[PDB]
Ligand binder design. Sequence first.
Ligand code: MG
Ligand code: MG
Ligand code: MG
Ligand code: MG
Ligand code: MG
Ligand code: MG
Ligand code: MG
Ligand code: MG
Ligand code: MG
Ligand code: MG
Ligand code: MG
Ligand code: MG
Ligand code: MG
Ligand code: MG
Ligand code: MG
Ligand code: MG
Ligand code: MG
Ligand code: ZN
Ligand code: ZN
Lengths: 96, 114, 55, 68, 100
Amino acid sequence: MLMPKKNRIAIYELLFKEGVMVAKKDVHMPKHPELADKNVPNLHVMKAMQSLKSRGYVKEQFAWRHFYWYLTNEGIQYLRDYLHLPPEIVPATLRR
Amino acid sequence: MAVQISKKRKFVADGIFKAELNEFLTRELAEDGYSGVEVRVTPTRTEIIILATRTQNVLGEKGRRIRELTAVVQKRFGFPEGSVELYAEKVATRGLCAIAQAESLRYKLLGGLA
Amino acid sequence: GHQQLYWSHPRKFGQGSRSCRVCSNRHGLIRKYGLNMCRQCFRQYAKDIGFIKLD
Amino acid sequence: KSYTTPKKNKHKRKKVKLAVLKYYKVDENGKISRLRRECPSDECGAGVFMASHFDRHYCGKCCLTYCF
Amino acid sequence: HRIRITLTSRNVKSLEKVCADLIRGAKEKNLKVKGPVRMPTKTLRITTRKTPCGEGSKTWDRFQMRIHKRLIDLHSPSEIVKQITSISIEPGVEVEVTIA
RNA sequence: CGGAAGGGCACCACCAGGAGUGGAGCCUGCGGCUUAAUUUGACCAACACGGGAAACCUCACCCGGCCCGGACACGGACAGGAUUGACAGAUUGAUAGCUCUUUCUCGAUUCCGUGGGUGGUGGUGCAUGGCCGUUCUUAGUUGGUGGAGCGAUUUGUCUGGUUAAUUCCGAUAACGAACGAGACUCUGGCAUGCUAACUAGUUACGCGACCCCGGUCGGCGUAACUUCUUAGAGGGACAAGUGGCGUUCAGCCACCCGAGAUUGAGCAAUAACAGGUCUGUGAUGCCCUUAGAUGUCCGGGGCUGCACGCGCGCUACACUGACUGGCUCAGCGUGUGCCUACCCUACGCCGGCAGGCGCGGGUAACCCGUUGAACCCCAUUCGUGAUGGGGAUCGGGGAUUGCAAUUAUUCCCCAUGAACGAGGAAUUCCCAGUAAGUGCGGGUCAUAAGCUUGCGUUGAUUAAGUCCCUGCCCUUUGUACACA
Ligand SMILES: [Mg+2]
Ligand SMILES: [Mg+2]
Ligand SMILES: [Mg+2]
Ligand SMILES: [Mg+2]
Ligand SMILES: [Mg+2]
Ligand SMILES: [Mg+2]
Ligand SMILES: [Mg+2]
Ligand SMILES: [Mg+2]
Ligand SMILES: [Mg+2]
Ligand SMILES: [Mg+2]
Ligand SMILES: [Mg+2]
Ligand SMILES: [Mg+2]
Ligand SMILES: [Mg+2]
Ligand SMILES: [Mg+2]
Ligand SMILES: [Mg+2]
Ligand SMILES: [Mg+2]
Ligand SMILES: [Mg+2]
Ligand SMILES: [Zn+2]
Ligand SMILES: [Zn+2]
């Protein structure tokens, strides 16, 4: 994917803050639904997290028409040392 | 509701909500004895009850996976934050649930038992 | 351009505009009450929706 | 299978060596003017360069064709 | 003050349990009531060919969804009926209470 | 299995019949032919079936052109720049920078090879799951222990009577059980008794309009009530009562009482078919394809093509009728959608009509809507003539939906006026609110019912029987049959 790295780091920010992420199986979304702020297509989002899951940092589920992605511990390793983030911060699924 | 949905399509819309909720939890927690759900609604928050066998594993370490799939349910269905809550409970008399016994038979066949 | 070409055809009506709620299937939908799912998967999930065969 | 009418070849991007060099001019001391005309584009003040094409000016980002 | 309650469910016995419970709640908090009026049951009927393929004897399912709706009128203040509707409801019954 | 016997049973069988179909036009589906393609599944239990009413989409088929949506790993080349996008102008269909030429930006996301994945309405339903259909709408099926036989097996599961029924009484080397039938659920029919109702009403009462005290009003408001309306809880019918028939058992016939003295569906066993579905799926084995793609997209075409054959249907062949006025009656339902952009409409104007333009109601017992529906009833005209029957074919114009209608999408107006004179061999569905006539809703739907699923409405002839033909079940018997 010739991905705007802006948008890819933004999707990584969504995955980290809202600790896991859902999307619709729809390459022809005009624009992705979870975020209203940026401009990233659901096609970019889907293939970005397929590139995430192929080397094994996120795990996939598919119900009726929606991809579900769950960020594993190796994924939280890769995501924090990729986003250059110190280990004081944790996802909202880990906050209690 | 300001868009003011009618009652006829309202009951089939939350019926089809409970259907895809049950099928989503079936595709996820089939490894861990997911028996069913019960969805009961109040004003400003909605109690959705997963009813399964291995409650220790549907919670997970510390309760991580329940918070994980509360976030999944809210993000997928467009629920407001903290407006629905997942509670996980134990099957009374585990042997009689044909769902859980079909899944236990399925994992016996997948583990290789004759 | 290809940005103005790739999904340029209108999906405003017809068979391919609507799709199955569970399958991305275009045949045998039931739009009554906004189920928007095919008849096979409807009669699969019908007892879970609430449509019980009284007679 | 087989198809005897020949296929279209891929437009290979023309490999050029240090094409950024041709936008400014160099004197040995501080005398620098610009070979390619600048943009009144709203996104870019004076950063990116236009082109001097086969006859006549054009910018690719804002895509503005300046004609005779 | 003419505050009205509507009860709507796919189920009949749970709905009438909730409506008689609210009548007795209004009676124990001592205010009159125009009774539970029963407006007609809306049927949602679906007839589909039972077969996934095309062949077979041309048979048809007859699926139905019954929806029952009843009304309770109360001349009363607001927090009385708010605390009576905060309690004693079955999951199948949808309650909608409006003020005017 | 029998063109062998004995019993029973079913309008997917017959008799008495009714409406037909087969004959005509048209619609649709299938075969054939044709074609770039006119994709394809299925040939009682295929053929108005795939919810399959395809202009685009669907689309899978055909002609062309784009795109990667080829992850991930390894190894190259690379910021001295790996490589996206690019208006001109040519070419092209397209302003696809698709390719050529001139060159500008993007900045590590990506390209180049090898493994490997992925997508597939590609194949195989004769690798499969699920689901349906069918055997098979009949009454059938099976363990435990005991008896018989060396055994496959058998008895239980039966001589008889009886029933819709392997339903019961009863016999008894069987006893005690399970499924199926029944029971059950919904529906229908009856309550002037219960519960109550400004999202339903009735009756009064008071104002209002009109007619010569009274009458009409679906004109306006309130004091009782719930018969009508809505839907809840109970009830109500059990072969209960009576008279016969029968071992006087199971039960059958008739009659009083009665809203009913058989309402209609749903569910539906054991075993099975190499019945259908890989074209419903992110259910799926394997195979095949995988950048010149069988992936996806866009443009156009085709799915409709006509010497012909068959099937489901609608319109008809008219006087029991057509046409033109008038009068007066329903019940199902549905209605502004996550994406989703397209709802049902009163009412006021414009237009012959299709329709157009405005202000309103309705997320619905509120508004459309008291759903002023058709056949029907009444009064005209027509006159037995392919006729004022029938309305196919076809010319010209006017609207609506669409991004676009040409191979006329749909509707409107005028003109055109064909076959068809009650249909050969053959063949279907049906017995009570049934057949048939009739029109209205849902699905399909942007536009949209010659279909189908429901609904009312007018509403009978005939029958309460049989094993004759087609079949089904049980017993006996015969077999050289066992893919029977
Ligand atoms: Mg008979
Ligand atoms: Mg006959
Ligand atoms: Mg014929
Ligand atoms: Mg004919
Ligand atoms: Mg097409
Ligand atoms: Mg196409
Ligand atoms: Mg597939
Ligand atoms: Mg088969
Ligand atoms: Mg087969
Ligand atoms: Mg090959
Ligand atoms: Mg066709
Ligand atoms: Mg005529
Ligand atoms: Mg069409
Ligand atoms: Mg004539
Ligand atoms: Mg026959
Ligand atoms: Mg059809
Ligand atoms: Mg002999
Ligand atoms: Zn589906
Ligand atoms: Zn510029």
